[PDB]
Design a protein around this motif. Structure first.
Motif, PDB file in Angstrom:
ATOM      1  N   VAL A   1     -38.861 145.616   3.761  1.00 27.86           N
ATOM      2  CA  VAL A   1     -40.321 145.568   3.592  1.00 27.86           C
ATOM      3  C   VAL A   1     -40.722 146.134   2.226  1.00 27.86           C
TER       4      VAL A   1
ATOM      5  N   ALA B   1     -44.641 141.824  -8.413  1.00 29.40           N
ATOM      6  CA  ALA B   1     -44.192 140.931  -9.478  1.00 29.40           C
ATOM      7  C   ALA B   1     -44.938 139.582  -9.475  1.00 29.40           C
ATOM      8  N   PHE B   2     -45.161 138.974  -8.299  1.00 33.00           N
ATOM      9  CA  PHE B   2     -45.985 137.764  -8.185  1.00 33.00           C
ATOM     10  C   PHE B   2     -47.402 137.995  -8.699  1.00 33.00           C
ATOM     11  N   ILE B   3     -48.136 139.011  -8.225  1.00 32.81           N
ATOM     12  CA  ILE B   3     -49.543 139.158  -8.636  1.00 32.81           C
ATOM     13  C   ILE B   3     -49.693 139.590 -10.096  1.00 32.81           C
TER      14      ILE B   3
ATOM     15  N   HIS C   1     -41.619 142.760  -4.675  1.00 34.42           N
ATOM     16  CA  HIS C   1     -41.705 141.335  -5.024  1.00 34.42           C
ATOM     17  C   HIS C   1     -43.161 140.851  -5.127  1.00 34.42           C
ATOM     18  N   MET C   2     -44.029 141.224  -4.179  1.00 40.45           N
ATOM     19  CA  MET C   2     -45.469 140.917  -4.204  1.00 40.45           C
ATOM     20  C   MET C   2     -46.175 141.489  -5.439  1.00 40.45           C
TER      21      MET C   2
ATOM     22  N   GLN D   1     -47.630 138.727 -12.649  1.00 43.57           N
ATOM     23  CA  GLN D   1     -47.441 137.510 -13.427  1.00 43.57           C
ATOM     24  C   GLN D   1     -48.439 136.400 -13.078  1.00 43.57           C
ATOM     25  N   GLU D   2     -49.013 136.355 -11.876  1.00 43.14           N
ATOM     26  CA  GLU D   2     -50.109 135.440 -11.535  1.00 43.14           C
ATOM     27  C   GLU D   2     -51.402 135.800 -12.281  1.00 43.14           C
TER      28      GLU D   2
ATOM     29  N   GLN E   1     -39.924 143.517  -0.362  1.00 44.31           N
ATOM     30  CA  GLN E   1     -40.996 142.515  -0.328  1.00 44.31           C
ATOM     31  C   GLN E   1     -42.297 143.007  -0.987  1.00 44.31           C
ATOM     32  N   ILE E   2     -42.697 144.269  -0.791  1.00 45.04           N
ATOM     33  CA  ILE E   2     -43.849 144.869  -1.492  1.00 45.04           C
ATOM     34  C   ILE E   2     -43.638 144.825  -3.017  1.00 45.04           C
TER      35      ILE E   2
END
Lengths: 358, 54, 81, 170
Positions: free
Chosen positions: B5, B14-16, B11-12, B18-19, B8-9
């Motif tokens: 978990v 890194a997504f936001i 990773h989230m 770079q988004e 995954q936090i």
């Protein structure tokens, strides 16, 4: 022949997990011939794109597989002889399927790594959709010429019931261009011909004696002209049919014999002039469709890896050639190497099938 | 398991990160494109107008 | 944009529910759950059910649709927060 | 070996071959179909757009200036009006000077092709264009732009078109 593709994270860098993987899959036994796989560092982005692509790439895989299979089948459909040479003509990057799978190259010029996953997927969709448009066009060109040559061949094959009038019709056997005179034409079996030689004179009034004139004879049958006065003809033809003498009227039809000869020459010549261009276009289209097909595999692997491990990427794309005697043990070693990551698997998994060449 | 978990936090994040950069970069890329289009169209039109005057 | 949902589900569904969330939002869902301080009464049957709260975190509407589809599949209820 | 055109053109057979050597695999070995020409059609931008707007294929632009120099571009898409830029990396500019020269994409920006209400243009790099043409296809401009790092192409940066053509692959 089949190949498997996998992807999984490195401990800190992509090399470290591969060193254990390829060793176990080749050294415990020959579970698979094992290597890295050539997926480059494409420009990552939002989950909105990655998840959309995770469904769209699956629909595109099924479509692009259907197209590359159709290209291969069209090459097999022009190779109606030398059928086994299909594997010498289906090539990608100038090499056999097993070789370009084993030695894959991502085309960094046709598919620039700095473009988004959506843009690259759309280039494949558009490109291969035009290959499908070209296959509809080239089918309409080839299949009609194929069917016409098959019908010209069917008009040459078999007995006098089916072989061409143009091979046997000659002017001296006919009485025509007249007000009160006709020539009729009839087919008879070779046994029944011995009755027909007299019996035609009994079918109707207004028939002159000794007016049956054979154009040719074969393994089953005869075709003859009958020369007679015009009043005889409709009773003659009807009573011929009632006695199983088969009417096949062809009154030295110069336009029709010329059409059979010219079209036999033309459709054979045009089928050859289609075959060369078709093999060349199908080679380019197969290369591009199979390259693009493996680019969908690379995109599905990449997108799912950037999902399953996020954007701080260190995963290795990998290639396996499974052995059918030990494929269950191959899955067990892949699980043993990767059970800590999570048909379905804790590692990323996909496949490529070489049976496009049958 | 909580360790996955936490992965995954991270990773989230890194997504936001770079988004947010990806949205900003699309706005900036469009800003440079519209700068090029607007500057080009205006300058060449006015340059041709003064050239006809000359 | 960031996005999240919160809701309530029967506690025995949790292991299949979290697995299905990690299948549809492939390998990536932050979530938490807890049992309610008492079971809650059914408005039609009067049965008392050992429900549990949950919260789920993501980015964008594409993941919102996947988590919501799985919530409905397990007959869970989401609420605005 | 060298390509056949559907009609006569601004180009010699030696020019046709020198351009055909640069074709991408989507269009290699296709005969060339006339899309537009000032020798066959009205001298205006709207005519070039209208004659091209029914297409969905790559095109070859050819120009002769009033100083007899030949130049143009291969482009991946038909010429049209455009709100933003369009086209892809196979696009290039070219000239005979008198030897053939080509200016492929630099990779610096995606500013390949655009069309205004009153102009046609290629490239970007600030106020600069690798090619620009007015609403009549009469006045045009050509200078080094960061999309292609191109030469002047015409005899002079400002030029008048003598004649212009567009061709496609079919």
């Amino acid at each position: 022949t089949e190949f498997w593709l996998i992807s999984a994270p490195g401990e800190k860098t992509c090399q470290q997990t591969w060193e254990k993987l390829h060793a176990a899959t080749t050294k415990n036994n020959n579970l698979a011939v094992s290597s890295k796989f050539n997926i480059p560092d494409l420009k990552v982005g939002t989950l909105d794109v990655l998840v959309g692509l995770s469904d769209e790439l699956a629909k595109l895989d099924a479509f692009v597989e259907g197209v590359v299979k159709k290209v291969a089948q069209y090459m097999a459909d022009v190779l109606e002889d030398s059928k086994d040479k299909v594997q010498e003509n289906l090539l990608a990057s100038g090499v056999d399927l097993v070789t370009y799978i084993t030695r894959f190259q991502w085309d960094m010029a046709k598919y620039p790594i700095k473009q988004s996953l959506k843009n690259i997927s759309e280039i494949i969709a558009k490109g291969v959709t035009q290959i499908d448009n070209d296959l509809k066009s080239r089918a309409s060109a080839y299949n009609n010429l194929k069917g016409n040559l098959q019908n010209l061949e069917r008009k040459n094959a078999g007995s006098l019931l089916t072989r061409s009038l143009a091979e046997i019709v000659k002017k001296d056997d006919f009485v025509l261009d007249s007000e009160y005179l006709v020539t009729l034409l009839v087919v008879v079996p070779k046994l029944n011909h011995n009755d027909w030689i007299k019996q035609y004179e009994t079918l109707a009034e207004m028939v002159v004696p000794r007016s049956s004139n054979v154009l040719s004879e074969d393994q089953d049958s005869y075709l003859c002209n009958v020369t007679l006065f015009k009043k005889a003809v409709d009773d003659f033809r009807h009573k011929a049919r009632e006695n199983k003498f088969i009417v096949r009227d062809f009154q030295y039809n110069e336009e029709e014999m010329r059409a059979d000869k010219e079209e036999m020459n033309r459709l054979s010549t045009d089928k050859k002039k289609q075959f060369g261009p078709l093999v060349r276009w199908l080679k380019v289209n197969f290369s591009e469709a199979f390259i693009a097909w493996i680019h969908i595999k690379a995109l599905r692997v990449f997108v799912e890896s950037v999902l399953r491990y996020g954007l701080p990427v260190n995963f290795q794309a990998m290639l396996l050639q499974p052995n059918k005697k030990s494929v269950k043990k191959l899955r067990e070693v892949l699980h043993e190497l990767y059970k800590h990551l999570d048909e379905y698997y804790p590692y990323v998994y996909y496949k490529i099938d070489c049976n496009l060449l049958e | 398991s909580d360790a996955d978990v936490q992965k995954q936090i991270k990773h989230m994040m890194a997504f936001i990160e770079q988004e947010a950069n990806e949205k900003a970069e699309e706005i900036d890329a469009k800003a440079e494109e519209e700068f090029n289009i607007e500057k080009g169209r205006l300058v060449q039109t006015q340059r041709l107008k003064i050239m006809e005057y000359y | 944009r960031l996005g999240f949902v919160a809701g309530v589900i029967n506690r025995e569904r949790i292991p299949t529910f979290e697995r299905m969330l990690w299948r549809v939002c492939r390998g990536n869902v932050f979530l938490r759950q807890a049992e309610i301080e008492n079971p809650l009464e059914d408005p039609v049957t009067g049965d008392y059910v050992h429900k549990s709260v949950f919260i789920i975190f993501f980015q964008g509407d594409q993941l919102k649709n996947r988590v919501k589809k799985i919530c409905e599949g397990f007959r869970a209820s989401l609420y605005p927060c | 070996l060298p390509i056949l055109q559907s009609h006569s053109a601004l180009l010699e057979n030696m020019h046709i071959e020198q351009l055909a050597r640069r074709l991408p695999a989507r269009v290699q070995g296709y005969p060339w179909r006339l899309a537009y020409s000032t020798l066959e059609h009205g001298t205006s931008l709207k005519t070039l757009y209208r004659k091209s707007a029914s297409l969905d294929s790559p095109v070859l632009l050819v120009i002769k200036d009033m100083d007899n120099q030949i130049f143009g571009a291969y482009a991946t898409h038909p010429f049209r009006f455009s709100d933003h830029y369009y086209g892809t990396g196979e696009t290039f500019l070219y000239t005979f000077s008198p030897n053939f020269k080509v200016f492929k994409w630099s990779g610096e920006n995606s500013y390949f092709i655009n069309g205004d209400i009153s102009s046609l243009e290629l490239g970007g790099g600030g106020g600069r264009f690798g090619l620009w043409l007015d609403a009549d296809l009469y006045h045009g401009r050509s200078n080094s732009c960061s999309t292609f790092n191109n030469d002047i192409l015409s005899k002079k940066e400002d030029f008048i078109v003598q004649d212009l053509e567009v061709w496609t692959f079919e």
